[PDB]
């Protein structure tokens, strides 16, 4: 009666899941690592000198992010993430929160830098800047369940109203290990701002078992 989902099947994404997030047009994962942005770029613009966030096209521990609810929520396990709810993303390998802010990005002076911040900063003065949403492409899908692989979204920053974006026409220089740049795109409706959740790394037994649906005969 019971079957086990293959890796490639969709599952509901719940709060406290550890997920990877894949960009539709480039197949890159949202990635972070210890390296920091250069203090000053070649054109003289200054960065935040914060932790880099990049796009990386191979499986890696540094692609893993824990999905968290906002402060003051009373959420336990088994609670699905819904489209357009405010969420936070904690980078598992470094224990830092995803953050965007109105600082010019590495290659695009008019797009925003994406970084991560410490727990103390992110749960204190910088909290509002750690809020994102899995924004549905159509507004009527607000409140629908987020599922892996099959549900498109924009990774939307609440405080500055940008959508996280990446590209593979040109890559970061050696300081960014020739990974894809990530930045916050002010042109929210560009279809190149579309992502999915690729994997739920800490999937529980409740969600690995399913009963196959029956195809109706013609």
Author numbering: 322 to 539
Quote the authors verbatim.
Protein O-mannosyltransferases (PMTs) are conserved endoplasmic reticulum membrane-embedded enzymes responsible for the transfer of mannose from dolichol phosphate-mannose (Dol-P-Man) to serine/threonine-rich protein substrates or unfolded proteins. PMTs from three subfamilies form obligate dimers with different substrate specificities and require the concerted action of their transmembrane domains (TMDs) and a luminal MIR domain for catalysis. Here, we present structures, native mass spectrometry, and structure-based mutagenesis of the fungal Pmt4 homodimer.
Aside from minor conformational differences in the β4−β5 and β8−β9 loops, the scPmt4- and ctPmt4-MIR domain structures are highly similar (RMSD 0.87 Å over 194 Cα-atoms) and comprise the characteristic peculiar β-trefoil fold i.e. six β-hairpins arranged within a pseudo-threefold symmetry (three MIR-motifs: MIRm1,2,3), altogether forming a β-barrel and a triangular cap. Overall, the scPmt4-MIR domain closely resembles scPmt2 in its core fold (RMSD 1.38 Å over 168 Cα-atoms) and accordingly putative binding sites for O-mannosylated peptides could also be located in each MIR-motif (α, β, γ and δ). Interestingly, whilst in the scPmt2-MIR the sugar-binding γ site of MIRm3 is sterically blocked, the γ site within the scPmt4-MIR is open and comprises a LWTH motif more similar to the α and β sites. Characteristically, the Pmt4-MIR domain structures reveal a unique β-hairpin insertion (β-ins) of seven residues (RY(D/E)(D/N)GRΦ) in β2−β3 of MIRm1. β-ins is extensively stabilised by internal hydrogen-bonding and a central salt-bridge between the conserved 4th and 6th residue (ct: D370:R372, sc: D364:R366). It is fixed on top of the cap scaffold by hydrogen-bonding of the tyrosine (ct: Y368, sc: Y362) to a glutamate (ct: E441, sc: E434), and of the centrally-fixed arginine to the mainchain around a proline (ct: P434, sc: P427) within MIRm2. Consistent with the temperature-sensitive growth phenotype, the glycosylation pattern of Ccw5 isolated from yeast strains expressing scPmt4 β-ins mutant proteins Δ362-368, YxDxR and W496A is very similar to that of the null mutant pmt4, demonstrating that the enzyme function is largely lost in vivo.
